[PDB]
């Protein structure tokens, strides 16, 4: 369970922390060249920095196993299509370069990110009939924890953000994974100001959405609820629905009034970085007993169980 | 002053620049204390200004070798940094000193200048709330950018009231904080291109006018200028319009502008540093009034480029 998975990770991290490979700290792919992540440089005029005109996606590899890589690359392709972007490399070649980068980095628990930007020329002065010269950036990095393992044992502190709302879909489509974190960064600052660690943003219409890079799932009377609109369709949320269906628990991706967060039995977040992240304190008050809930634990175990299932992952050779 | 005169003098200076041997005449950038040609300027990939676009920016201008309202732009950059808990990593006068030096080295007489202040290498997510960040500074000067080409400014451009996208509300991102998160604006540009236009006008989502893809919108109706107050960036060119209009006896109202006023307006013109005053003569595939640039637009156009040579609004750059 939690102790077993975390213990094995801390052993793997000890091996990585005393490695001599300079790429063990990170590796990046820029225009066909592999460089240490610290030595990664992009053009200043790239429209992915100029106007954040890009999409991105983050797969993960745990214990040397890429977790649901097909799903993330498929979502990256869908996001590119929605923003009139093209994946600059074939999907299978992108997969192969990712395994090669991870293999050279020797990292077994890694944070992997792919970024597809508009290029050096913007959309303002664009002659119709031409397409854009989109750019591709990729890098591998040690596994990032939105919630540390020790905190996952006891649950974290969350607030319902009052000073900031989620960017509506009519402005930016949340189903397109974007790096425009204006509202999310504001939510993080508010959470820090209010003695918490995780912000939950409202839909602006008294509905729940998501937080600073994670989906929110409520548990109430044996049924799981998660917001449908205004949110990114997370892969970890997709894994939660898969695990729950195998456990006989049904998840309802529907409109969630914000009051349900205060009346819920359990609350937990989901993202590729932290994984399953239970929340035990809401608005400086414990959820129920102040401890991680039962349904949260079953989903936690199932999520990390399918990390070793060949149907959801494949092994990397070092 | 005179539209033909100003454009003629500009194109003459541009002819000198286009056949120059200086490799920096195409652009020069300041990255971590180093001066480099604009084309080969590189930033760290892990910079949180690229990772999560957690930054601010601002654009001063240099016309005919004169920095235009640099103090106003630098003050707005500091105010934007303060609002999102950022600090200008260098003293205000040193930032001014390098900017004049960069323009002088580039030999560019009509320049687009941009300053970018990013969060740094460490993000805000996993950061101890008690420590401060080592913010980064990037700046570069580039040949003057035209959101509207001079030939088109004589006759005006085509604008649409965006139907597929709304402006990001202030409750999500404060528009007074000049940001590069152009999700809605890029969507507006795509819609304008799809609808046979060049400039999108975005609504606030509440049947009110706001702004466009990097420019303020100003309507003139029955001799009075109207411009949206909330949901927009307080542009320096818009502030210059208010100064010029006040000097011309024209009344400007920074108030809430219902979208209906754009269809009932006598003249429409946009404002941004990258281009100056940009009249709009066709809105939603329909002529505005006479199909030509209006009188009030021309009076404001002349006054805007007039104060570009006024010592109260500008200062001269000593070249080599
Ligand atoms: C990608 C993303 C998610 C979902 O993360 P998965 O690991 O894909 O479940 C949630 N919120 C934001 C802002 C995201 O960008
Ligand atoms: C830069 C910008 C403007 C124009 O500001 P000036 O100081 O007038 O150039 C207007 N709206 C937005 C959104 C901008 O980014």
Summarize the structure.
The structure is a homodimer. Chain A is an alpha+beta fold and 318 residues long.
Question: Can you put this structure into words, describing what you see?
Answer:
It is classed as transferase. 2 copies of one chain form a homodimer. Chain A folds into 2 domains: 1-143, no CATH class; 144-318, no CATH class. Chain A starts with a helix and ends with a strand. Chain A has helices at residues 2-17, 47-50, 69-82, 91-105, 149-154, 182-193, 235-247, 259-263, 294-305; strands at 27-30, 33-36, 41-43, 54-57, 60-62, 65-67, 110-117, 135-142, 156-165, 198-202, 208-211, 215-220, 223-227, 251-254, 266-271, 275-282, 313-315. In chain A, helix 7 crosses helix 9 (294-305). Chain A is of the alpha+beta class and 318 residues long. At the A-B interface, strand 3, helix 2 and helix 6 of A face strand 3, helix 2 and helix 6 of B. Bound molecules: pyridoxal-5'-phosphate (PLP) (2 copies).
Furnish the topology, listing elements before pairings:
2 copies of one chain form a homodimer.
Chain A: H1 2-17, E1 27-30, E2 33-36, E3 41-43, H2 47-50, E4 54-57, E5 60-62, E6 65-67, H3 69-82, H4 91-105, E7 110-117, E8 135-142, H5 149-154, E9 156-165, H6 182-193, E10 198-202, E11 208-211, E12 215-220, E13 223-227, H7 235-247, E14 251-254, H8 259-263, E15 266-271, E16 275-282, H9 294-305, E17 313-315
Parallel strand pairs in A: 9-10, 9-16, 13-14
Antiparallel strand pairs in A: 1-2, 1-8, 4-7, 5-6, 5-7, 6-17, 7-8, 10-11, 12-13, 12-15, 15-16
The site of one pyridoxal-5'-phosphate has 14 residues of chain B, from helix 7 and strand 14.
């Amino acid at each position: 369970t939690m102790d077993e998975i975390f213990a094995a990770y801390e052993k793997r991290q000890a091996v990585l922390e005393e490695s001599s490979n300079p790429l063990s700290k990170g590796i990046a792919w820029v225009f066909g060249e592999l460089v240490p992540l610290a030595e990664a440089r992009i053009p200043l005029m790239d429209q992915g920095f100029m106007h954040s005109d890009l999409t991105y996606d983050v797969p993960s590899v745990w214990d040397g196993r890429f977790f649901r890589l097909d799903d993330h690359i498929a979502r990256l392709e869908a996001s590119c299509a929605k923003m009139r972007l093209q994946l600059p490399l074939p999907r299978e070649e992108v997969k192969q370069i990712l395994v090669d980068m991870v293999a050279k980095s020797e990292i077994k628990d890694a944070f992997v990110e792919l970024i597809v930007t508009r290029g050096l020329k913007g959309v303002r002065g664009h002659t119709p009939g031409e397409t854009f010269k989109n750019h591709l950036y990729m890098f591998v990095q040690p596994y990032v924890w939105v919630m540390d393992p020790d905190i996952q044992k006891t649950g974290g502190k969350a607030i319902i953000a009052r000073t900031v709302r989620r960017i509506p879909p009519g402005s930016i489509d949340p189903t397109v994974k974007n790096l425009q974190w204006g509202d999310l960064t504001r939510g993080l600052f508010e959470a820090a100001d209010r003695g918490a660690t995780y912000p939950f943003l409202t839909d602006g219409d008294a509905n729940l959405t998501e937080g600073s890079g994670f989906n929110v799932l409520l548990v109430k009377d044996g049924v799981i609820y998660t917001p449908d609109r205004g949110v990114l369709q997370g892969v970890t949320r997709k894994s939660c629905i898969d695990v729950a269906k195998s456990l006989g628990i049904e998840v309802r991706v529907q409109f969630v009034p914000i009051q349900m967060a205060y009346d819920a039995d359990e609350i937990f977040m989901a993202t590729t970085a932290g994984g399953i992240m239970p929340i035990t304190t809401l608005d400086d008050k414990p959820i129920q007993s102040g401890k991680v809930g039962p349904i949260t634990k079953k989903i936690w175990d199932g999520y990390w169980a399918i990390h070793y299932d060949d149907a959801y992952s494949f092994e990397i050779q070092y």
